[PDB]
A paper describes a structure:
TMEM16F, a member of the conserved TMEM16 family, plays a central role in the initiation of blood coagulation and the fusion of trophoblasts. The protein mediates passive ion and lipid transport in response to an increase in intracellular Ca2+. The protein is inactive under resting conditions and becomes activated in response to an increase of the intracellular Ca2+ concentration. Fungal TMEM16 structures have defined the general architecture of the family, where subunits, consisting of an N-terminal cytoplasmic domain followed by a membrane-inserted part composed of ten transmembrane helices (α1-10), assemble as homodimers.
The pronounced coupling energy of 1.4 kJ mol−1 obtained in a double mutant cycle in the background of the strongly left-shifted F518H illustrates a strong interaction between both residues in the active state of the mutant protein. To probe whether this interaction would trap the protein in an intermediate state by preventing a further separation of α-helices 4 and 6 to fully open the subunit cavity, we have determined the structure of the double mutant F518A/Q623A by cryo-EM. In this double mutant, the truncation of both side chains precludes an equivalent polar interaction as observed in F518H and would thus permit a relaxation of a potentially strained conformation. However, the structure of this double mutant does not resemble the open cavity of nhTMEM16 and instead shows very similar properties as observed in the mutant N562A, with two predominant channel populations. One of these populations is symmetric with both subunits residing in a Ca2+-bound inactive state, the other is asymmetric with one subunit showing an inactive and the other an activated state. Their similar size indicates an open probability of about 30%, which is somewhat higher than observed for N562A. The conformation of the activated subunit strongly resembles its equivalent in N562A, except for a small movement of α4 resulting from the removal of two bulky side chains, and there is no hint of a further opening of the cavity, which provides another piece of evidence for conformational differences in the activated conformations of TMEM16F and nhTMEM16. Remarkably, we find a similar arrangement in the corresponding structures of the activating mutants N526ACa, which concerns a residue that is neither located in the α4-α6 interface nor lining the pore and the double mutant F518A_Q623A, where both side chains forming a strong polar interaction in Ca2+-bound states of F518H are truncated.
Author numbering:
A (entry chain B): 50 to 78, 91 to 119, 121 to 143, 202 to 219, 233 to 253, 264 to 414, 451 to 475, 509 to 638, ...
B (entry chain A): 50 to 78, 91 to 143, 202 to 219, 233 to 253, 264 to 427, 449 to 487, 504 to 587, 591 to 639, ...
Amino acid sequence: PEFEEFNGKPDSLFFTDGQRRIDFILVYENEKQKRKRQAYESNLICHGLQLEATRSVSDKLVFVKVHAPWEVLCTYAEIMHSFFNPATRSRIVYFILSRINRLVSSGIYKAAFPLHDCRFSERYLLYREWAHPRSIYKKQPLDLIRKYYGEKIGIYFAWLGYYTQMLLLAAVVGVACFLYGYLDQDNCTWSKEVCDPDIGGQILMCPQCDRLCPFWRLNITCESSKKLCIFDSFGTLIFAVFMGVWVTLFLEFWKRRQAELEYEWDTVELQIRVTLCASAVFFWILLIIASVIGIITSITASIISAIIIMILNTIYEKVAIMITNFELPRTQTDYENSLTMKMFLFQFVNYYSSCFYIAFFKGKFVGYPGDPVYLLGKYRSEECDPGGCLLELTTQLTIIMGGKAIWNNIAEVLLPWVMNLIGRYKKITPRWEQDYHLQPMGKLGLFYEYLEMIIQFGFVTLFVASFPLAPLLALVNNILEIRVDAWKLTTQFRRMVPEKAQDIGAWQPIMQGIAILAVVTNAMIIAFTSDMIPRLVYYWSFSIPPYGDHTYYTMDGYINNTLSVFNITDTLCRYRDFRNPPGHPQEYKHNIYYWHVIAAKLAFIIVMEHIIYSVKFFISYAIPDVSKITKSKIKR
Amino acid sequence: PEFEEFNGKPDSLFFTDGQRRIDFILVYENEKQKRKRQAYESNLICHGLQLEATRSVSDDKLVFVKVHAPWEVLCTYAEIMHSFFNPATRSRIVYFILSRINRLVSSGIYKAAFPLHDCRFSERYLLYREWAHPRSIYKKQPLDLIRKYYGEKIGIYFAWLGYYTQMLLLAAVVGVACFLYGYLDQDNCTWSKEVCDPDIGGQILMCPQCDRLCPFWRLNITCESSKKLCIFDSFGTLIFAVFMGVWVTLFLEFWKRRQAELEYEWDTVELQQEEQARPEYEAQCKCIRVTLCASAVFFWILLIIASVIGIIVYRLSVFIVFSTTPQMATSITASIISAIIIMILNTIYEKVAIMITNFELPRTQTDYENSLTMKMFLFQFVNYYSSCFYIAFFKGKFVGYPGDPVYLYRSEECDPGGCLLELTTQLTIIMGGKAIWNNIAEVLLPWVMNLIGRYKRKITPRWEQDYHLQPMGKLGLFYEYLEMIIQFGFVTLFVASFPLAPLLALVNNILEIRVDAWKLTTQFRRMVPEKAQDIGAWQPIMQGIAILAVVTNAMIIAFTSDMIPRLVYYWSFSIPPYGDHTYYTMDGYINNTLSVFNITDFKNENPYIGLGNYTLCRYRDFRNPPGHPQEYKHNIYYWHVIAAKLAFIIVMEHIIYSVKFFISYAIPDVSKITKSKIKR
Ligand SMILES: [Ca+2]
Ligand SMILES: [Ca+2]
Ligand SMILES: [Ca+2]
Ligand SMILES: [Ca+2]
Ligand SMILES: [Ca+2]
Ligand SMILES: [Ca+2]
């Protein structure tokens, strides 16, 4: 019932009078809608908040600024247990309005948001010094961003930076291991003997399809094998072990950082059907696993992958929102945890189903060219690429991390920017006005940034047994990522209602599960996917006299016998299996070597799982989750 | 001190005037110490406590000091720490006042201290009639009553032992079920019935185990053991091992549910004030000493390992004289000897560990408890499970073949059906001996000390009737917890051997809860109440045991239990390209697997020709038989088998770990009724 229009002040941090402060904005643009809106406004007035409705220069849309006086905000802060910064004021006013999401969900109320500082006073400082591209190198003023945006976004950015630093450590170690593998390429006997036309040229390997792809010569595989040997060497072993250790150190030191930030910022604040739903979600998960597996220069492929992942992500968001309400406990925290879990599961499938397929599905469920697996009209489950499943996984992971990360950040800046541009399309205006035209932060928007980084963490840790440059790629990605997120939140997206975050959130159990699954997955990649264990077993057994023709053990002769002599009966070929060349009473069957092979690597897998989990337990035991200095300031 | 003696009323917890009750007892019996003691007496006078000092009739030097607190003092100290004041509350308040006594008692000026009993064996009389008694062995425990009498930690220990007993009930029932399945299928054990078949079992010519004076013992001598061996490694045992993983999972979650229930019920969660330093720690006001202390532990760890190696040497030395089946008696005697040596070394390490932890400096008593827990649990783990891990995972594993056999010297071999029979014998011996002898000792030792104290030397008062009993000590139920954790390790870590492991163990627990209870009311004194919401460091330990158990169990089934070789035969070698049977069956297993050995031994001796006149003997290994281009050597079979076992380990580990994760995640650590009561 109050209206006053004034756009004369461009940098109006206050109302028309200037005494009050902007603590929120609600936009108002049938008769029963008007009655309900008036009832809510009267309730708001009775709570004590001071409201002011104004008409924009460009009419029909009316902005309703609000300002909770000092007494009411002080009382509500006491409920949670100029003096207060605008972040806390916005959070308090939003909590008051909550007892507003239901209103804005329907068409009765359009939108509401806290007001920013100014254009590009604190946003100017944290834009030029922190958010502007001119200041990429310098670290973020964590206290300043905590002051402005909030504790939840602050914890997100602090976690992002810490994860970047730990990525830098793992990345320098990965670069060391990568160069150790790369320099030792001329001494790689297998690569050279494959490259030899006398050996490599004569030997032949089996076709992937049924008379579609013909027989090919090892020359292409000889050329591709050098990169495989670069990514298939004991440097990969040492880096996988180091990554098993580094995940533990990462998690533990982040526990320490969480504790220290909890002390510094007082983040700790307080205020049958299930079985059927689980069965349905498992069915959907396997369905989309099948979808992605069936789905499966560099810039175009990366863009295509990004678009596919985007549309699939939209589908997952739709289906998860549809299915969550059936088991909704009418609890926002429980609902958001369930949505986090379901969206993460859909994304986990969408991203890592192809990777798991490359690792442990190509060449595994394919029988010998005599009677392979035939399921339906679709036939002959495709064999692994002759270059190497490790090579394919490294290619796919590099594509995903690098290209999809740069494209995701380009989208993260442009899409809000272009939406803001087309909104402004629809002269001087107050700096509190344009924040309406630019898009509001979506529901659980920061959940998406957290999910993106959790997906990157999964790519880096889960599949690090392939190539050690994944931490480096994710390091540069994080360096860009933190600043693009800062820029979009500073400029494109209006101010988000500050939250309180004791930790990052539901992604912590996700990260722990990813750590355990990453240990087991790295072990099974090294053994099952990479042929290093059969390489070593051939070396050590079939190179010493009892099984080999060499006086001292040497890997020579491995190539002449890794090809299982073949006669085509549904000249010689070999698929992904150590089989029995003719001369045995049974041929095309699990060979003497093959049991050596599986026993060796899965015994290596047992050893590695046990030692890595032992080291993780020892680290969690030895390394406290609370720092010494944190205890010293706690006892103060 | 108002020192005056009057035995008078034989059973009266009140003063000479009788107006006020009594909570505690301090016994004592020079000038500087006499000056110092009366100073603290004046300190308690300023603290308001009331103490009655009596010059006991039996010894004129002995003086008892009965301790009580006035109601105002009780109220203000109840304010300090978070018939109205129950005797347990009075005891806790009194000792908190005394602590705010450790140094004076340690210094020897005050001889001892304890909390009073009601009467002879009236809370104590009721607690001895319907509880703490062999006749009442089949009645539920008055847990709230023993909480009001003894204290919080005592209550939680007895609750934990009862809950362990309950869970072992179902564990033992399922174990008996699988054991019955194996016993029933014993009639159709093709390999064992083949062993006891003179046509095939009588033609088994197994190679000698030792070089000197050991014949080629045929399978006939072990036929009867084979009868009870097919039961030990049968698919029912495997199913029970999986169920044991499940029950291990179910155990601790419901325990912590019950523990939170008791936290709400007894209001265990109270003011955890800063702990007082131990008197010995403050007497002398460290990293090198700690590292030196750790070195002492690991040196003795090798010592018991060396004692275990002596058992290995003993079996090697004593089999020949037994031979002149002998190996069964040898194993039984060796297991008895190992149990005796474990019991002997247990007390030795108890004393030396108390001394060692005295040597190092814990800043608080709970730090002492944690360090002692770690050292004691480590040593007792090594003690009890060293022989068991040896039999399960070392004995017979690395013997090679008759040509160039392994030397150290000449490590032990094992029977065709594995050493799960010997491990079963060792486990049964250890656990049954633990029950019978350990519990008899648990009763007698405090009773024996009571008897010898009485012989030192009729109307006697409560304080005289109770001081002439062994004080419990500041540790207390540490050792019964350790005993039950050792039993848990035996039951779960080793359950792949015999499913009846809980059953007899169940027996123990029942008997256990009474014998201990007996000594806590009859033989020993009453122990001072302590506050302890949880059983403490033992709970993480069990978790580790749980995490260990799965692995161990899988390994025992894969490595120790020979079931995997038989499944490998039954699904891969009955085929005509590998055997002769048209379909899948287990017959021919023994004739097929254990390859022969023609007598061509390496000269690195050759006692085979000296000790017999046989041509080809059959060893229990899959290596190459004669006619092979590289004979007496590994073949396809052994690596097939080892891949089967390791893959079984991986499958069982991952499946069982997944199931444990699912159960812990699905079943919350807080009960719905518990949360409802908390909300109300
Ligand atoms: Ca990105
Ligand atoms: Ca982002
Ligand atoms: Ca820690
Ligand atoms: Ca006992
Ligand atoms: Ca006992
Ligand atoms: Ca649980």
